[PDB]
Amino acid sequence: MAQKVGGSDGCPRCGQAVYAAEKVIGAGKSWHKSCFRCAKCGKSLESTTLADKDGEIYCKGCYAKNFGPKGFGFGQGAGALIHSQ
Ligand SMILES: [Zn+2]
Ligand SMILES: [Zn+2]
Helix, strand or coil: CCCCCCCCEECCCCCCEECCCCCCCECCECCCCCCCECCCCCCECCCCCEEEECCEEEECCHHHHCCCCCCCCCCCCCCCCCCCC
16 A cells, blocks of 8 residues: 555455556545445445445445335234234
């Protein structure tokens, strides 16, 4: 990790370092274009659909796919079991 804010930029993720610069960033990490790994939906991501924090990350694939948490799946869960069933 020499030089700052561009110019030679390596990848803590795959354990390679980049010269052609495929470097992204989050918080103060740096990644490849194709290493960005949401550990929230558990998915390999896309380029510009991401969200960093601290030194981990979840995805704008996620602030997308779950743009609005609440619930969905037909049934509720609290129906008519009534304790004992
Ligand atoms: Zn990488
Ligand atoms: Zn995600």
